Every structure is written in C-alpha cells, then in structure tokens.
C-alpha cells in the first residue's frame, strides 16, 4: 500500500508491525478514517491546551446555574471534573451530530474523512495532496504531542 | 423557483441573489410560506416603530401620569401597564390585529383556526398587502418589487435594531446612545 | 345454449368482480368517496400496496428530512428529561411552591417536549424508511 | 373462498402478516421456526450432542398459525437473539458486579453494593446525566440494530450480528465464526447462569456457596 497519503519526507511506509497482513484494504481503510479522525481531535486538543494558557481562559462563567466560571475551571485533565457534566453531555452531542448527520460507513466518503467541510480546501490535485497529507503529518505530530500533555498534566499535577 | 418567487432574497452585489435559508424552512413549509412572509413583514414593522420609539422619548416625551412617560426604555413597559397606557394601546391593536391579520387569514374568523383551518385568505401576492397608502406605490412592476424589498430589509435591519437597544439599554441604560 | 346453475354462478362471480374494480375509480361518486371521508386524499397517499407508510402520514412536515427530524427528537428528548427530572426530584418545583415561591417556567417548557421528541422519532423513522 | 378484503385473523385465505413498525412494509412470515432449529448453532456435547429445547419453546411460532393466525410467540430466530443479547448483557451484569465492588470511576456516588448503585446513581445530580447518556447510546446501538423482524424468523441478519468488529475477526480465513459462535452462546448462559446465582445470593444467603460474603 502506496501512494495513500501516507508516507512522508523523513519517513516512508513506517511499519515495525503495522498492517500486519500487508493487505486488507477493508481494514486499511477503517485505520485511515482512524487515524484521520485522531489527528484532527488531536490537533484540535493541543490548540484547545494552547490556547487558554496563551489567550486567557474565556471572560464568561460557562454555567449560570452551577456558578462555575471559565476562569475557574482549571486548564488541563482538572478541567473534566470541574466543567458541569451536563456540559460534557452537550459536548457529546455535538460529537453525535458531527459523527450521526453524515454517514461514514466504509466505502462512504466519510470513511476517508470527507465531512464536506473544505474551508481550507484547494483546486489542483497535487495543491490538494499538499494540503491533506499536511493535515495527516499535523494530525500525527499533534496526537503525539496531545498524549504528551495528557502525560504531562498526570504526572506534574498542572498543566504544565 | 425559491421561496415560492417571494421578494426579498435579493442580493446586494447583483444577479447572484443572497437566498438565505440555511435551515431551508421556506423548502419544507412552502404552503405556510405567505404565514412567514406575513409574520416578517409584521414583525418589520412593529420593530421599526419600536426603534423609532426607543429613540424619541429620550429626545421629547409626553406630559403624562409621570410614571410611565417620565421613565427610561427599559423600565418603561411595566410602569405603562399600570398606568392604563398600554391596556388602551393593547386594546388599539388587538382590534387592529384581530380585524386585519385574523379576517385576511382566517375565512371564518369567528372561529379558531383549529375549527376553521383553511388560512387561505393569506396568497403569496397579498402577503404585506394591508391596502394601506397603494397610492404612494410607483406604477411599474419593477420599483414595486424595489419598494417592497426595500420595506423587507429595512424591517429586518428593525428587528435586528431593536433588539441590540433593548439588551444593551437593559445592559447599560443611557439614551439613544446604548453604549456603557 | 342451456345454461348451467355454474355458469350463473361465474356470471355473479364476473359481475361482482367487475363491480368491485369499477367502484373504486372516479365513476361511481358516493359520499363515502369524499375527500376525509374514506379516500387516501387527492395527491398524498398515505401507503401503496405493501402497507408501508408514505411521507405523506405526516402532513405539514412531510418533506423534512429524516436526519433533521432525528436531531429535533433528540433534542426534544434531551431537553424534555432535563426539565422532567428539573421538575420532580432535582429542585423540586412542589417543594418550591411549598416555600412560597412561583414554578420556574423554563422546567415545564423543557418538560412539555418530551410527547413531541415521541412523535418527532416515530416520524423521523417514517422519512429515513421512505429515503427523505 | 372468502373476498379479498374481510380476512383477518382466523378466516380462510388470510395469509399471515407482520408490521408492528409504523413505517414498514408488511411482511408475510412462513412457520419456519422448527425448519431452522434443525440447521441451528447450538446444541454441544454438554446435553448429548442434540438441540436442548424441552417445553418446545422453539416450536411455539409453528404453532401461532394454528392459534390464531397472528405473530403472538417468537420465532426461534428472535428466541436466539434474544439468548445473545442476554449473554452478552449478563456477560457485562457479572464482570460489573466483581467490578463496581473493588473499583470506582465517576463523579457517581460511592456505592461498592450492586444492588443499590442503580439507584444510587438515579439519585445523583451528576449521575442522572451520566445514566442518560449511558441510556441514550444503548438506544442508539439498539435501535439500529433493531431486529424485531426476527419475531417472524425474517431478520435478514445472523443473530448478534450488530456492526461492531474491530478486530479481523469474521474476515480472516481461519478463525472458524462456528466455534466462536458457540462459545459466545454457550458463555452467555454461563453468565446468564452467574447473574441468576448473584441474584440467589443476594436474595438467599447461602445458595451458591462461593458468594456467600458477596454482596
Ligand atoms: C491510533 C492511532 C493511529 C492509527 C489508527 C494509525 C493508522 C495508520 N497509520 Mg499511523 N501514526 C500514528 C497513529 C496512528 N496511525 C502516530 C501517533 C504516528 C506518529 C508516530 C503515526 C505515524 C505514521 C506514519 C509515519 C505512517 C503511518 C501510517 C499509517 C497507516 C498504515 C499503517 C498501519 O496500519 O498502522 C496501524 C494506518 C492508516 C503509514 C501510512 O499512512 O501509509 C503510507 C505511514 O507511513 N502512521
Ligand atoms: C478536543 C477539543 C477540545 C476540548 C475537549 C475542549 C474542552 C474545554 N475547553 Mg477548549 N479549546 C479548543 C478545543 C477543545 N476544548 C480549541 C481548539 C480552542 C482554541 C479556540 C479552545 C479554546 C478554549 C478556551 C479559550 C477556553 C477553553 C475551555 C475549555 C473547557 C471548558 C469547556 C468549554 O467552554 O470549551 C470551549 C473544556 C475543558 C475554557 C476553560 O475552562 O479553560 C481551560 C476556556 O476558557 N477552550
Ligand atoms: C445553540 C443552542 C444551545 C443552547 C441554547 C445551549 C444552552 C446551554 N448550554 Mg450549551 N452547547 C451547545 C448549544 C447550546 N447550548 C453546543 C452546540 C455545544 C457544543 C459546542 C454546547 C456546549 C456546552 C457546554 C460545554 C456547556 C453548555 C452549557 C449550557 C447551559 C448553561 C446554563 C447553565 O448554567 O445551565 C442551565 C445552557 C442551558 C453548560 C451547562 O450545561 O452547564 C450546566 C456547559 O458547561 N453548553
Ligand atoms: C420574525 C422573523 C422573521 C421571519 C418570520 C422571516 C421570514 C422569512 N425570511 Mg427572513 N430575516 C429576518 C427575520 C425573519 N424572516 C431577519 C431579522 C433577517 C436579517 C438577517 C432576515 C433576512 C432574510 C433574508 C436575507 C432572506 C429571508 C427570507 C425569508 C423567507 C424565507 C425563509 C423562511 O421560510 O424562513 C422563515 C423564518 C422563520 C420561521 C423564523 C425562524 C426563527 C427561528 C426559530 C429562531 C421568510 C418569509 C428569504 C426570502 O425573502 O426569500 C425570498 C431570504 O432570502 N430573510
Ligand atoms: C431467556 C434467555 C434465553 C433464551 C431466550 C434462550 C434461547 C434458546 N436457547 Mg438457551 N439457555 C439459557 C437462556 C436462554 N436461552 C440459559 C441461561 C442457559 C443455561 C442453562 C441455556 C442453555 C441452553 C442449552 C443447553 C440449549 C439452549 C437452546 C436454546 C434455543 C432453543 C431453546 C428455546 O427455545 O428456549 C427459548 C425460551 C426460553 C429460554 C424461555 C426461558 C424462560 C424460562 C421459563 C425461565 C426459567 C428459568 C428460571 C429463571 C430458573 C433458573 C434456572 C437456573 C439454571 C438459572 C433458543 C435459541 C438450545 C439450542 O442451542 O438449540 C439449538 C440448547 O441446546 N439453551
Ligand atoms: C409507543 C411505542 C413505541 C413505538 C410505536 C415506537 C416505534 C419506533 N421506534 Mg421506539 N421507543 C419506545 C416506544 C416506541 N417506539 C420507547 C418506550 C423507547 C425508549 C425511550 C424507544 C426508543 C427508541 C430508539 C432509541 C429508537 C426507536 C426507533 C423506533 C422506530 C423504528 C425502530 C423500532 O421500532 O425499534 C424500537 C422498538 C422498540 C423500542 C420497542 C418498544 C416497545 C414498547 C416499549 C412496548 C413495550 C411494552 C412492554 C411489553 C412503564 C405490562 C419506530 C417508529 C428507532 C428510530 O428512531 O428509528 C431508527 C430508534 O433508534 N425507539
Ligand atoms: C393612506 C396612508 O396613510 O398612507 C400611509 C401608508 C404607509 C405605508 C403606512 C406609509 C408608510 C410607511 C411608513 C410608516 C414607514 C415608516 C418607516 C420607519 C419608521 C422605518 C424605520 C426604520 C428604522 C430602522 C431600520 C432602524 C435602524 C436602527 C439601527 C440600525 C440602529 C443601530 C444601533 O442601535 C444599535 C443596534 C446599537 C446602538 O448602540 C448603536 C446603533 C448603531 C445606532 C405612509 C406612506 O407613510 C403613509
Ligand atoms: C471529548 C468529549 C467528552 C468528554 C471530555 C467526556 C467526559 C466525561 N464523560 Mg462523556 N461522552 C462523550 C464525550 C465526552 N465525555 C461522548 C461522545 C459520549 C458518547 C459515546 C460520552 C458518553 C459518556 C457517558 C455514557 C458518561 C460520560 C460521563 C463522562 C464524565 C464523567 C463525569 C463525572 O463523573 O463527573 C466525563 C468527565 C459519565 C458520567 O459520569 O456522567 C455523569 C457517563 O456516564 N460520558
Ligand atoms: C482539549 C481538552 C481535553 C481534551 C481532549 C482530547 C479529546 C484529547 C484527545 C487526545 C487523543 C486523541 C489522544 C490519542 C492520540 C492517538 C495516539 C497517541 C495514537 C498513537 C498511535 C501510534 C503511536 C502508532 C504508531 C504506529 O507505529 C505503530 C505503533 C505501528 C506502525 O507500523 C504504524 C504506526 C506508525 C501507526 C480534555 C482532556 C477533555 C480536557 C482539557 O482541559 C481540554
Ligand atoms: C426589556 C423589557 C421587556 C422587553 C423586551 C424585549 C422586547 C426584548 C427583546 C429582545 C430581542 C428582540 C432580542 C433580539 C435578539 C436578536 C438576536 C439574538 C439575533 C441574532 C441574529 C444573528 C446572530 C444573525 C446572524 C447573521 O446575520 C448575520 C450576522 C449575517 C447573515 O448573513 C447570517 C445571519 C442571519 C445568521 C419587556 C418584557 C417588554 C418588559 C420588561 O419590563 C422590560
Ligand atoms: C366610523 C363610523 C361611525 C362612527 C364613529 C365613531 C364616532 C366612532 C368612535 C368610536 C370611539 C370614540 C371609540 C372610543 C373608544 C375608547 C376606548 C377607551 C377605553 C379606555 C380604557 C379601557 C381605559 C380605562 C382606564 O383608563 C381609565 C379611563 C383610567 C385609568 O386610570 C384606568 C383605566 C386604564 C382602566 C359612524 C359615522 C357613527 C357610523 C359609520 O357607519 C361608521
């Protein structure tokens, strides 16, 4: 399997075990949705670490009702036993309705991560394997870096 | 073609019209589309002279019991409901309402529309179309639509107004200027 | 020709048959025909031939779609349990009036939708199995 | 015979029907039922080699067209999705049961007993979003695995067979799905068997001599 977007410039088919059988296109392909899906939550995890330590936690409280503030919810793995977990049940609602609206069975467009978002999209096939394998190599650097700030948070107690 | 070919959806650039609905309710309610056209251009309306009156008071009021022209925006309502100020405009548009939009809409409006139905009286050609000041219209097709889109995004830019005023005011308070 | 007892028979059969076909189309015009009386009404058949409901069952929304009508169940849903549980055992609202304060309207508004995300399921599964 | 319209039921020429579903089209089932128990996974060496079905629960849908004509018992289809759905249920019920007792994971309230967590956590501000949650997906997984044609013995779909496989099973050459099959079965009863024992526990101290200082 070559040519999928995969391999890089200081890598090629980077495989000590993956792939196991070197076949399965099924099972090929549910790893890419996989692994396409794992680095944009990831990407989006570590910007969402980044984010409120560079740019100040959110002026508003994030629960009228629990007299919470978003300054006071700490930032970091604290932060999902302090944020209201009926906010956490909207959280996974909105991952209902972006996982449930469309369909992403294999085979399906969404099983290669085409949620018809584009936004970023570009026009030449090549412009177009620039900017997707850009997303898949962020996309991998930022679950790598995501897992190190989970690591991170656990073992020095703060966010950082 | 969208909207059932109602006025409004134009765009300001040029032949490439805006059409917003992004959730598509004039598609899937395209028989409860005048009730829609009809309810904007009323709630136009109504906040076009809500705008205009949250501006003018501050400038000149009424004499009057005291306590309801002689108070802010915000405050205001509650004090004009005591005063039997806006009983008697209440009373003023509830004939207006129930006489104009409740006999054009309901073909039996001595009935609810849970015993009448029907609602048809509301076309999309009449859906604004009170009658009121046809004089004033320009006789060509084309400045009547230009007339009637200017009235839509004027009462949407109404709407919007007024609803910026009312929650800043309630915010900060102040005058015609709501800023803090 | 000597008709048989059998053959007055397949005549009946015949015109029974015929009958039966022929009264179901425009040509017979009996009250029980009228629009809300037995018919499917004019352009919006409920179901075919197989007994499987139309989108037609179910009138002013029967064009949206089945993915739209599973987010406004579920919402309805959601937000029908919040206000339910909000109502009778987290903060109660009796206990509330007990102390001499009114309901807190947004609990009952939350809590009126749970019979429409009932009926908003029941037909979105009518428009994801008619495709919509 | 009878016309076409007035058959319902019991009345001669009325071919079977099945549409429980507002929004299905109406299927018509064959007995069946008996048919498919002879060619049926199941039926190991624990009970003689043979298909263990005393009380003939497996026969009762042949038997609906001779009650009244009408769906009124399952077919043997839907008596072994259910028997799956239950060992896999029950599966889960025991290996929480030994769980909950040791460890804890929520904001849910400190409950090692299992016969009271349920509650417990139906009384918990933050449990009650939780158990909704937990209710909702069940809902979502189940419904759209929803069977219920199996009542008739058309499911179009072996039982337990919802689309959940992430590993290569069912998909690599060897790894016969028969023998996995028969140990999913045969480890639901088991732990159909455990839950019921737990239950006797709970309920009559002493029964299963191996819970008897369990909860
Ligand atoms: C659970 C997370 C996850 C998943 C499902 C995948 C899945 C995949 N990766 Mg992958 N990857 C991950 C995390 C993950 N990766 C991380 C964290 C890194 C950074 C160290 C990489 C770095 C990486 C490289 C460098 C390459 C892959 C490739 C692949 C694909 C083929 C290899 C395979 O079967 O691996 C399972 C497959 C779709 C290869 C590919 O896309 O094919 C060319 C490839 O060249 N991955
Ligand atoms: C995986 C994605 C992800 C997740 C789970 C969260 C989760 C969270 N974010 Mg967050 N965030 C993200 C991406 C994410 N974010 C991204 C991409 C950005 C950049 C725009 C931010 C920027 C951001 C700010 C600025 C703040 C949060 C805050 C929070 C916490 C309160 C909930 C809230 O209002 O969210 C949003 C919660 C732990 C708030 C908080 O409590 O601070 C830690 C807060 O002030 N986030
Ligand atoms: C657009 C519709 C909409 C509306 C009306 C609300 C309304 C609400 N959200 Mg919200 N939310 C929404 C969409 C919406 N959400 C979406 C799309 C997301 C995901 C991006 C979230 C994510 C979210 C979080 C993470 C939290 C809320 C919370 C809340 C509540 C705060 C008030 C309070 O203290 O509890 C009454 C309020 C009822 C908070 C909450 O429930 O606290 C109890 C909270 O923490 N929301
Ligand atoms: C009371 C508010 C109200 C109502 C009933 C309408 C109604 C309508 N608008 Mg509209 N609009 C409004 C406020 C409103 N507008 C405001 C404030 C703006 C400024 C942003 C606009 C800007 C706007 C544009 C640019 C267009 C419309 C159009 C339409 C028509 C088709 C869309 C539709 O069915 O939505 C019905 C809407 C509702 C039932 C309101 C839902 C409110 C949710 C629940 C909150 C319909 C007659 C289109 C049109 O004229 O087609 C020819 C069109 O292109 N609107
Ligand atoms: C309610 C759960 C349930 C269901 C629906 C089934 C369904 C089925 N089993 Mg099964 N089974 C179960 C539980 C269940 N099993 C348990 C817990 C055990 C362990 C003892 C077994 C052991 C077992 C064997 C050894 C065999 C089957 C077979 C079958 C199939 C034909 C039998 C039939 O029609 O019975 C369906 C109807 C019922 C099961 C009715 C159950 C209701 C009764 C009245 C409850 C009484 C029990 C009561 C609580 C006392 C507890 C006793 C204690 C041992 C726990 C069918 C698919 C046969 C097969 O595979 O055929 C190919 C077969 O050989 N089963
Ligand atoms: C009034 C009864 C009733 C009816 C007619 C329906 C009908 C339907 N449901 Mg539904 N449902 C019901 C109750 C009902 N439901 C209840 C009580 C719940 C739990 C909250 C659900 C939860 C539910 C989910 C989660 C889903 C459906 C779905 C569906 C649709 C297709 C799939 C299906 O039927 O499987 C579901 C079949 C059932 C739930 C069987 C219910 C039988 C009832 C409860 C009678 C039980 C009585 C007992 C003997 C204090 C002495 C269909 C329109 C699906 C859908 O929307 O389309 C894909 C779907 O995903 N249902
Ligand atoms: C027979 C007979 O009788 O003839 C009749 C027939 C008929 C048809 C009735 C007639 C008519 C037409 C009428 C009555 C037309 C009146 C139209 C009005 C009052 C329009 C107001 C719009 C205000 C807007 C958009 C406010 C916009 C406000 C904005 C954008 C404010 C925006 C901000 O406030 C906000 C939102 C925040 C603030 O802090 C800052 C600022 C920026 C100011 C006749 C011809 O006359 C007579
Ligand atoms: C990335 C977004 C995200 C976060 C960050 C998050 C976090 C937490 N989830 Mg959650 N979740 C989703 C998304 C997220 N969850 C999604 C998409 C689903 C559907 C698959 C889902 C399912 C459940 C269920 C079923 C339960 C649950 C709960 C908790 C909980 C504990 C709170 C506490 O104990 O205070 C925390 C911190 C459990 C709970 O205890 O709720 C009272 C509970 O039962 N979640
Ligand atoms: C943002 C935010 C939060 C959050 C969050 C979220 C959702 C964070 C998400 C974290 C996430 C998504 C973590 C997974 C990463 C995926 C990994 C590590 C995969 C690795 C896989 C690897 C390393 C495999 C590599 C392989 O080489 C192997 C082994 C064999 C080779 O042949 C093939 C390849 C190359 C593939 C909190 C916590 C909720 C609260 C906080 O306050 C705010
Ligand atoms: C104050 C007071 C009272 C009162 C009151 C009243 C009347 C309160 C009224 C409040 C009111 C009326 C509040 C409106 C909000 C408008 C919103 C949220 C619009 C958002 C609109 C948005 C976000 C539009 C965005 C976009 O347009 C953008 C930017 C570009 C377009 O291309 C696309 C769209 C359209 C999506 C009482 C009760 C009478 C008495 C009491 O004693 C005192
Ligand atoms: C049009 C027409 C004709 C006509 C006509 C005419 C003249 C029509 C005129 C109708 C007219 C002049 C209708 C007045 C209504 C006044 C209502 C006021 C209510 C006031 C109320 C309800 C308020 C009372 C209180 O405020 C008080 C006073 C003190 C406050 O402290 C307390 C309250 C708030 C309780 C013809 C020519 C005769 C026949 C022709 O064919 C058709």
């Given at each position: 399997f070559e040519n999928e977007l995969g391999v890089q410039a200081p890598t090629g088919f980077f495989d000590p075990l993956g792939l196991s059988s070197d076949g399965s296109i099924d099972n090929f392909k549910r790893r890419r949705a996989s692994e396409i899906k794992h680095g944009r939550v990831a990407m989006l995890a570590t910007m969402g670490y980044m984010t409120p330590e560079i740019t100040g936690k959110f002026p508003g409280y994030l629960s009228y009702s629990q007299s919470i503030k978003f300054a006071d919810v700490p930032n970091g793995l604290a932060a999902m036993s302090k944020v209201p977990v009926l906010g956490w049940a909207q959280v996974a609602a909105y991952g209902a309705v972006c996982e449930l609206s469309q369909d992403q069975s294999p085979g399906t467009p969404g099983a290669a991560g085409d949620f018809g978002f584009k936004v970023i999209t570009s026009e030449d096939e090549e412009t177009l394997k620039r900017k997707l394998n850009s997303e898949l190599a962020n996309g991998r650097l930022a679950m790598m870096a995501i897992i190190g700030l989970f690591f991170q948070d656990g073992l020095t107690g703060g966010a950082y | 073609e969208f909207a059932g070919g109602l006025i409004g959806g134009q765009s300001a650039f040029a032949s490439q019209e805006y059409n917003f609905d992004p959730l598509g309710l004039?598609?899937?309610?395209?028989?409860?589309?005048?009730?829609?056209?009809?309810?904007?251009?009323?709630?136009?309306?109504?906040?076009?002279?809500?705008?205009?009156?949250?501006?003018?008071?501050?400038?000149?009021?009424?004499?009057?019991?005291?306590?309801?022209?002689?108070?802010?925006?915000?405050?205001?309502?509650?004090?004009?409901?005591?005063?039997?100020?806006?009983?008697?405009?209440?009373?003023?548009?509830?004939?207006?309402?129930?006489?104009?939009?409740?006999?054009?809409?309901?073909?039996?409006?001595?009935?609810?529309?849970?015993?009448?139905?029907?609602?048809?009286?509301?076309?999309?050609?009449?859906?604004?179309?009170?009658?009121?000041?046809?004089?004033?219209?320009?006789?060509?097709?084309?400045?009547?639509?230009?007339?009637?889109?200017?009235?839509?995004?004027?009462?949407?830019?109404?709407?919007?107004?007024?609803?910026?005023?009312?929650?800043?005011?309630?915010?900060?308070?102040?005058?015609?200027?709501?800023?803090? | 020709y000597t008709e048989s007892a059998q053959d007055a028979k397949l005549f009946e059969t015949v015109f029974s048959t015929y009958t039966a076909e022929y009264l179901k189309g425009p040509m017979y015009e009996t009250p029980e025909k009228m629009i809300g009386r037995r018919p499917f009404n004019p352009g919006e058949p409920l179901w075919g031939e197989d007994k499987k409901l139309t989108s037609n069952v179910l009138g002013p929304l029967k064009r949206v779609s089945s993915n739209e009508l599973a987010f406004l169940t579920m919402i309805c849903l959601a937000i029908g349990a919040w206000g339910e549980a909000q109502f009778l055992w987290f903060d109660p609202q009796f206990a509330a009036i007990d102390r001499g304060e009114y309901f807190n309207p947004i609990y009952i508004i939350a809590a009126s939708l749970l019979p429409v995300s009932f009926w908003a399921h029941i037909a979105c599964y009518i428009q994801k199995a008619n495709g919509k | 015979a009878h016309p076409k319209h007035m058959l319902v039921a019991g009345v001669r020429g009325y071919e079977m029907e099945w549409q429980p579903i507002p929004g299905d089209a109406v299927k018509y089932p064959k007995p069946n039922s008996e048919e498919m128990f002879k060619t049926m996974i199941g039926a190991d060496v624990e009970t003689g080699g043979e298909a263990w079905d005393p009380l003939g629960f497996h026969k009762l849908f042949d038997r609906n067209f001779d009650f009244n004509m009408l769906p009124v018992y399952p077919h043997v289809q839907w008596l072994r999705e259910a028997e799956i759905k239950h060992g896999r249920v029950c599966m889960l019920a025991f290996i929480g049961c030994f769980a909950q007792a040791g460890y804890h994971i929520g904001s849910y309230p400190v409950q090692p007993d299992w016969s009271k967590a349920l509650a417990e956590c139906y009384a918990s501000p933050t449990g009650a979003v939780g158990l909704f949650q937990i209710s909702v997906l069940i809902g979502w997984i189940e419904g759209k695995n929803y069977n219920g044609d199996a009542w008739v013995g058309m499911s179009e779909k072996e039982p337990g067979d919802l689309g959940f496989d992430p590993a290569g099973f069912t998909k690599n050459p060897d790894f016969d799905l028969k023998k996995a099959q028969l140990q999913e079965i045969k480890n639901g009863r088991l732990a159909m068997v455990g839950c019921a024992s737990i239950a006797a526990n709970h309920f009559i101290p002493g029964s299963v001599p191996l819970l008897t200082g369990f909860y």
């Open positions: - | 004039a598609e899937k309610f395209p028989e409860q589309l005048p009730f829609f056209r009809e309810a904007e251009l009323k709630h136009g309306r109504i906040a076009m002279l809500a705008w205009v009156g949250l501006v003018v008071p501050e400038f000149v009021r009424i004499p009057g019991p005291e306590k309801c022209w002689q108070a802010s925006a915000v405050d205001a309502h509650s004090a004009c409901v005591e005063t039997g100020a806006l009983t008697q405009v209440f009373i003023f548009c509830g004939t207006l309402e129930i006489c104009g939009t409740w006999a054009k809409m309901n073909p039996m409006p001595y009935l609810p529309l849970s015993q009448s139905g029907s609602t048809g009286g509301l076309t999309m050609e009449n859906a604004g179309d009170y009658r009121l000041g046809v004089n004033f219209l320009p006789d060509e097709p084309e400045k009547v639509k230009e007339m009637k889109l200017k009235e839509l995004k004027n009462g949407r830019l109404a709407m919007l107004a007024f609803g910026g005023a009312i929650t800043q005011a309630t915010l900060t308070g102040s005058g015609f200027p709501w800023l803090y | - | -």
